[model samples]
Target: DDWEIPDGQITVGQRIGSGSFGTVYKGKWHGDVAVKMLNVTAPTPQQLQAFKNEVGVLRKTRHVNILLFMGYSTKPQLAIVTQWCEGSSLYHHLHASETKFEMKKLIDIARQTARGMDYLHAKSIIHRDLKSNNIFLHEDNTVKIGDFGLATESGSILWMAPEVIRNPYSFQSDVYAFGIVLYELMTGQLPYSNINNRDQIIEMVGRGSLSPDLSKVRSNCPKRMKRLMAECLKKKRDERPSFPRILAEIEELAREL
Candidate 1:
């Protein structure tokens, strides 16, 4: 079995969120689940391939910090079913909620993400997109990285690694985006909010001349944390530390906290 759920075995419920590519629904498949239903009325060859790719990747991942892949269905509509996170995305917690995260809590979340990424990298898979939006928060503030629609390739605009602008998705590119995630958690603000246009941002980043300003990071953010972010955001991908190294640094910092 390729982990394909039969149509009769699943039941989708109220919509949770909608986007250009898909609509997420609170759903059921033997138990509580989240269904990401693709928006395509008729799937194209490329879209089908992408869906299959996401399924393939999800099935291989079995870490606590990685979303659980229940199964998928292509009959009623193209959809991916997985364990639902009640606490919602890190983006929502950072931007929409009034909840304030202590410095240590933020570091813990980052550590969980790093662990997840380390597992993926060891499996020879790159997340391609690693941002607050794709990282889900649990009730305990632990995080799970999800949303593999852009899995095999293509990262977000602002979170795009400098090398990713012109080159393919390398493991280091994910490290760069993780750096951006650190910035977001530290400052509680979006990167390049001062810039209004995508074209300019894209060009500047592609040229390896632009990155988030570290000065904007909150005062309470530790030096080690900032230093890690700097290393991860380095324009030269090779200079960035691997996920295992990142986890070690985070663990060291956590011990001091």
Candidate 2:
């Protein structure tokens, strides 16, 4: 069995979201929970390993900026549970589909996202998928990174670094993805939404892609924040700053806010 949540420990409610990786549901464990159900059984060992990898990573890593792992169920299906975030996801929030916040709120979101990446990198873990859809927001205006899947893949990365297309996944790739998240937060749009499409986002972003509304970023966001975006989205992975440094920079910006 997978990580069991006893029998009546959780009561699942409505389906909040779903994707190719897994399905997330709003449920109740101690109070509120989000049950992420992934079909990881036998035979196809790759997905099963991914399932195990995510569980292992969650078990090993613990941070408020990272989603809280509650429990899982193996009887019905492979379900990884966590605290249900009622404040919705960073994607929805950024799209204005959820609610409205201020520049300070953007600062909190950006800083917290970097903090989450810092924790992962400190633990020597690489979050292959680090996009807005994979990040959850809270009512307190903080963010938590989630959806660990592609850490085991090769060239099939989305918010990936230029070096990852041929080389293996590394912490630097996360910096690249983190920049995309920051870009989204800064412009309320995906990085390179027009010229360089997300379908080939890996290649597009790798070659110093478009996707920059620097004019708005310049006017609305802090100059340091803009610089951080540029540093993270650099063509050469080696040029990207470490998560700790990035976190430190964002923390300084947070003080300004």
Best by lDDT: 1
lDDT of 2: 0.75
How many steric clashes does model 2 contain? 1
Alpha-carbon TM-score of each model against the true structure: 0.92, 0.84
Superposed by TM-score, candidate 1 places the C-alpha of residue 196 at a distance from the truth, in angstroms, of 2.0
Worst 10 residues of 2 by lDDT: 149-158
Q: Model 1: per-residue lDDT, tens digit, 1-257? A: 57888787777899988986679899877778888887777787677887888988888889999988888888868888899777778988888785789998988888899899989999988888889998988775888898877677233788888777844788998999999999998888888888888887899988977789899988889899999999999989889999999999999888887
Error of 2 at 247 (Å): 1.3
RMSD of 1: 2.0
Tell me the TM-score of model 2.
Answer: 0.84
For candidate 2, lDDT tens digit of each residue in 120-185? 888888888888887887775778787776653232344666666535578888888888788888
**Backbone N/Cα/C clashes per model:** 0, 1
